[PDB]
């Protein structure tokens, strides 16, 4: 079969509505998530018109072989959703309400410059290509369009799944094309990071400082080295997997900077040993009690200067 | 085909039933289980009603495409069900009974606040969509529940596989829908962790406390720091991936306080020593003196009042 | 089609062989293995018996469409079985030979008590459920039971691969279903572990012995806690996936021993100290002299009395 | 169906163009990735030719079934492309204008020498074997060539997506095959390099510098070995999956240099406490203050050199 | 369709050829490597014989379902093999030339005794069951065996790709079977394991021999033990999937002498500190000076009877 011909010249109206029935497995390194949802589509296909005393039936139940279905495709999946054609009704003026549940891999990019403190605006884009008879433009069906209750993504709070209403119409390969965005915006649950990540790591960049309190080399060089070796390690044991960013990160300048202290404390750690052996036990004694402020009064306002930055 | 038309208004009745063959794969970071099963399905459909003396067979089977099939569906699987159908049976008054043999990845929220000593109800939910003709409504077959005596679920004891009676029946994208909820009630084996993971990890916080019997300075640093990052290497090592959580577990308070242990033992080492090197041995000796029983003490109490708050 | 019809009251009899091509894959955390191989079935369906002088044939070629062709599952899959129909022969008496080549991951439960000198009996369930017209029973073509000469598992000697004779014939839903166990029986090839993890881990625990030639408590903290780091460093390098086990295995116990050995030896280098510096050298003496014989003796005695216990 | 004939010996002429959507999953262990792309062919099929007059249309849409296709592969693929066919349209004179989407998984080469500074050119073969009845020719349409805007790799800038549209005509196993190569410009973003991964590094290499004005052995050997095991372990913690190369890459030679560089700092610091301990300071003073210098000089040589020799 | 009858008894011969696009993913760990590539058949079938003055072509085309066609399928895969169908042709004779593409993943056993100097000849073992009218014999079209000039093995160098002519017949469930083996000769690209991984790890090594030239007991505990972490840690940054195999590898041998080697260091390391401590310094100091040449030669003697051993 081939599309519904214009009464005008006027372009056919695909009325669409996505509905979250399930949403899992959001990927940070691969920059994807799936879901499981329903997909409506409405458009008019006036050869379908019928008259309810004659048929004796109010609406009309179609297989999709036998009616014309425009082809709607997303732009942003891995490989084309799987789909299963769940109902399809024609009213008397020949309104066709189509409906299918799907799954599909979303590719649809982060931003990590906030992160563990993000938010996330995540992308659903629809797609039509129009035909020689007619051109194929796509609406939204706001009544059509949500989530259920128990719809979660493991670590995300999930604030709204909306549709963007006005399509961008586009020409691509000589042709006509409708695209919609449907918006599911997801802010991270940073709640764990702080007894999880963020205090154990301080707690081992604190330890370090102890050698500001100790003239023993062979201590502060074990103090210094040790616990630098434990941030790394700890780093290995909380790792998650985030993309290499092509803009430098709240949380990558927070880990550089705590590589330079551990840097920094060994070259002080250096400096009051030399001095001591080069007989000047004054000047090794004020870099080390200088340290005991300096170190984390430049740490705790380098951190503001951060956040500041970042938020 | 079209469903089987009312006599009456009444909304058609169709009768559940899923027997457990196999369940494996719990994945704890996911919060997925896999399931092969066999879904039973029972309705009455007087179109298919016969009298058996001038047919000459007590049950007819059918094919299923030659008859009409209730489109029932999960709502919480990954993909769609593989499924075989294995038999229908017509009995003469146009009882149908419908048997499948499916697999499933389902997605199924877990509790990790009790983690490791933990239990947890897993959701098999059943779904019908009501039709233009008629409503359809879905039922337990409590002679048709059960599980294989040799289901087994690797590092899980299995309590129970029931059903909730009563269906959910709410509005959906226009229609009608009749939810089941299947229950699989589960709880984790935890001998494996006493031996595996909290024996060693205490004795490598204990072998720390051994710098109160110890006033070389040098030595006490190699302890504590050392045993920090054994305890880092040991979490390596056993590790198992639980997914980040909005809310605070038992084992997360544990090993946020294992580390604040680690961190005031650090202190305590720290101005041990500078008494000492301050010419205060006195103050230095009744701090390492008292550290002895208030470092293991404390750690007692605090988790009693933790295991207290979490049981 | 529907089944052959009973002579007298008879059960029909389908006469199973499995004929392994491939095993692969056997994973031991997940308790699954991957199996490539033959199905034969062989049954007698009258309906399909004829006069090879009239035909002109001695033997008859049917497409899996044309013929009644019995259900036969695995109960412990994941998925359905891959299967393709290799051939299908009718004799002159209407008996059926099928033979399908097919691939499927089998779920068999693993027995870790005696790791790595475990041995395993790996178990494919065949199965068919009953009709209304009549009973379906299985039974074992011991000579159509084989394995390829080439058929290896990494890591294991195939011993044997054999069926029980007696099928289980039980109820199940108001049916009753004829199970048979395909044993394919296998012993881990345990050489490797010597070299590779039994010995090195030795190694690494006879280094902390000589602390107890040593009067040096630095030096002692040092090889007592850098061994332990070793230990556990030694054991992320080697480690394999061994799932969570309810009931304590001969590895789980020796592993458990040596953290325990390495807390021993804290305490003795911690008391051997304390002794020193509170004046009493013959008690530290005495104890340290003592351990460089208790130490591998309880070692060697313990080993005997689990190896016992285990084997 | 069977290929339109010529009406001289003319080949036929399949016009294609490949215009991305998505690109995702650059794999460099696996040297693949994965693209979602329209792939366009355009040819004439006199049979399928009509009056529009008598038709009544313009356009005539097909069921790929329908009419004959020609067999367009993908040389360098893991598996066969999934496609969905999105458009067919004939023209009166019979050009046939075909549109499909596909989603592929990509085998191409990356050369490593570079890493991370390195520029990688993608390639998608496209291919056409031809028949007995008449030999098929690819062509490119440059019209129907080109990217989506939003397309991104994670990691890389996407430089130009072009054809080399001479085609490779050659024979295999006694047929014409016609090859076209599709290429994608990409060059790595460097950036998160140098903070995340280079300046650490460095870092923890300079710390073991600082043995060079310590005289104490003890210090000495604790600062170059627990450096060691720092780069080691940072090395683990921000490792990526590169292949192993039968050619010397840029990173590579780096990554040995600074393994020797600890080496012989281990040699320094073994010669310095040797002289010492043989009554020589003198010596051992002019090789530590030589080296506080040379090890940085040698240093910044070395990579000005390699940086030469690889760019 | 049944198989083309014998004129006199013969069996059916079917000339196989290989030609192969693309070689991936050798899987070290399970034994695996990924194939594309085309699979051609020939054999004469008189039924399909036509006069070509009669009929007008000079070849005739079929598809799959229309004729007759051997039923190959190889026996070391995981799954059945991913085909399409290319071509089908006829010559007036009935000679039919058969091609298809396709992608599989085969099980073929590696050779560890000599990694990383290692050469592997992979297997693809084609296979044929006889039928009940004639028996099936496999045949080598060498003119039809051959591969890409652009396949490439990541990690490999592909010498050759060849099949031995012989088929190998034989008996299996009352049938013969026809097997034809393929062989893909290919040698590991070992360079890079020298600057990656060999240098570096005897570099950590000679580290520990440094213990020789120092009297210092908590210097030689320091460098002994603290080289053996580098020493694991180093394994761990650098380690790939290789299985556990039942008999002893060249890599497995070095490895394990290695381990030996600090165990050795440290029985050295505490012996000349107990001698020292026990009144005995002359013994101490001739041990150690003996261990400076001891160690290194008994390192490149033991080497050296390896190298012979395994090569």
Same mark, same amino acid.
């Given at each position: 079969?081939?599309?519904?011909?214009?009464?005008?010249?006027?372009?056919?109206?695909?009325?669409?509505?996505? #509905?979250?029935?399930?949403?899992?497995? *959001?990927?940070?390194?691969?920059?994807? /998530?799936?879901?499981?949802?329903?997909?409506?589509?409405?458009?008019?296909?006036?050869?379908? =018109?019928?008259?309810?005393?004659?048929?004796?039936?109010?609406?009309?139940?179609?297989?999709?072989?036998?009616? @014309?279905?425009?082809?709607?495709? /997303?732009?942003?999946?891995?490989?084309?959703?799987?789909?299963?054609?769940?109902?399809?009704?024609?009213?008397?003026?020949?309104?066709?309400?189509?409906?299918?549940?799907?799954? =599909?891999?979303?590719?649809?990019?982060?931003?990590?410059?906030?992160?563990?403190?993000?938010?996330?605006?995540?992308?659903? #884009?629809?797609?039509?290509?129009?035909?020689?008879?007619?051109?194929?433009?796509?609406?939204?069906?706001?009544?059509?369009?949500?989530? $259920?209750?128990?719809? /979660?993504?493991?670590?995300?709070?999930?604030?709204? /799944?909306?549709?963007?209403?006005?399509? =961008? $119409?586009?020409?691509?390969?000589?042709?006509?094309?409708?695209?919609?965005?449907?918006?599911?915006?997801?802010?991270?649950?940073?709640?764990?990071?702080?007894? $999880?990540?963020?205090?154990?790591?301080?707690?081992?960049?604190?330890?370090? @400082?102890?050698?500001? @309190?100790?003239?023993?080399?062979?201590? $502060?060089?074990?103090?210094?080295?040790?616990? *630098?070796?434990?941030?790394?390690?700890?780093?290995?044991?909380?790792?998650?997997?985030?993309?290499?960013?092509?803009?430098?990160? #709240?949380?990558?300048?927070?880990?550089?900077?705590?590589?330079?202290?551990?840097?920094?404390?060994?070259?002080?750690?250096?400096?009051?040993? #030399?001095?001591?052996?080069?007989?000047?036990?004054?000047?090794?004694?004020?870099?080390?009690? =200088?340290?005991?402020?300096?170190?984390?009064?430049?740490?705790?306002?380098?951190?503001?200067?951060?956040?500041?930055?970042?938020?």
């Amino acid at each position: 079969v081939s599309p519904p011909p214009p009464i005008a010249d006027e372009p056919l109206t695909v009325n669409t509505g996505i #509905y979250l029935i399930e949403s899992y497995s *959001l990927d940070d390194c691969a920059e994807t /998530f799936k879901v499981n949802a329903f997909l409506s589509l409405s458009w008019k296909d006036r050869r379908l =018109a019928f008259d309810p005393v004659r048929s004796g039936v109010r609406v009309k139940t179609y297989e999709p072989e036998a009616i @014309w279905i425009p082809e709607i495709r /997303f732009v942003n999946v891995e490989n084309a959703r799987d789909a299963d054609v769940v109902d399809i009704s024609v009213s008397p003026d020949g309104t066709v309400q189509y409906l299918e549940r799907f799954s =599909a891999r979303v590719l649809s990019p982060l931003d990590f410059r906030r992160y563990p403190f993000d938010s996330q605006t995540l992308h659903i #884009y629809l797609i039509v290509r129009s035909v020689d008879t007619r051109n194929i433009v796509l609406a939204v069906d706001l009544e059509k369009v949500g989530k $259920n209750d128990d719809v /979660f993504l493991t670590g995300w709070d999930i604030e709204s /799944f909306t549709a963007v209403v006005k399509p =961008a $119409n586009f020409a691509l390969e000589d042709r006509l094309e409708s695209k919609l965005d449907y918006q599911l915006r997801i802010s991270r649950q940073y709640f764990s990071y702080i007894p $999880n990540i963020i205090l154990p790591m301080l707690f081992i960049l604190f330890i370090s @400082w102890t050698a500001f @309190w100790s003239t023993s080399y062979e201590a $502060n060089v074990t103090l210094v080295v040790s616990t *630098l070796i434990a941030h790394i390690a700890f780093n290995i044991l909380v790792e998650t997997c985030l993309p290499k960013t092509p803009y430098m990160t #709240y949380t990558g300048a927070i880990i550089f900077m705590i590589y330079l202290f551990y840097f920094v404390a060994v070259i002080e750690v250096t400096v009051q040993h #030399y001095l001591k052996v080069e007989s000047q036990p004054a000047r090794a004694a004020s870099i080390t009690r =200088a340290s005991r402020i300096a170190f984390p009064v430049v740490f705790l306002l380098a951190n503001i200067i951060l956040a500041f930055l970042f938020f």
